[PDB]
Amino acid sequence: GSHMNPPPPETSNPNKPKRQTNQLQYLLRVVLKTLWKHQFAWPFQQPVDAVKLNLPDYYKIIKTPMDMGTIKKRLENNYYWNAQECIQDFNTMFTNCYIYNKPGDDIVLMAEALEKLFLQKINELPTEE
Numbered sequence: 001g002s003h004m005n006p007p008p009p010e011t012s013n014p015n016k017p018k019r020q021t022n023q024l025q026y027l028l029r030v031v032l033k034t035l036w037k038h039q040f041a042w043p044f045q046q047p048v049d050a051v052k053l054n055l056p057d058y059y060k061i062i063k064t065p066m067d068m069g070t071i072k073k074r075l076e077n078n079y080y081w082n083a084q085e086c087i088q089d090f091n092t093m094f095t096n097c098y099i100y101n102k103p104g105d106d107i108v109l110m111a112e113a114l115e116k117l118f119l120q121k122i123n124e125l126p127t128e129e
């Protein structure tokens with residue numbers, strides 16, 4: 001895309017050790033699947049394109065970008081060692097939205113709806129085994 005957007009977060013690196021866990025499987029099959037199909041998922045399904053959205057300060061403010069397009073890739077092409085890394089990615093995505101935008105803005109209400117669903121699913125994250 002545009003040279004004025006940063007490269008996306010890393011999704012492939014052979015030097016990072018990888019592992020499947022039952023918790024990572026649940027994050028893909030239950031958590032990502034549930035959030036991806038939510039009515040309010042679409043702004044979160046790919047990196048923020050600050051050029052297209054005319055947000056020239058976005059990547060001045062947000063230095064830890066994350067989105068569910070990247071998380072989907074990290075899950076589908078097993079990037080992670082543990083579920084905590086993937087849960088942190090989700091939490092980063094939500095916090096980016098809450099830091100950049102005014103409380104009560106549409107995009108914040110959308111993120112908050114996804115986060116409510118996310119928390120319900122993470123409360124049932126299975127015991128690792």
Ligand SMILES: COc1cc(Br)ccc1CO
Nearest residue numbers: 043044048053097100107
């Ligand atoms: C996911 O972040 C988005 C998405 C849309 Br659409 C509009 C603005 C922002 C910045 O928070």
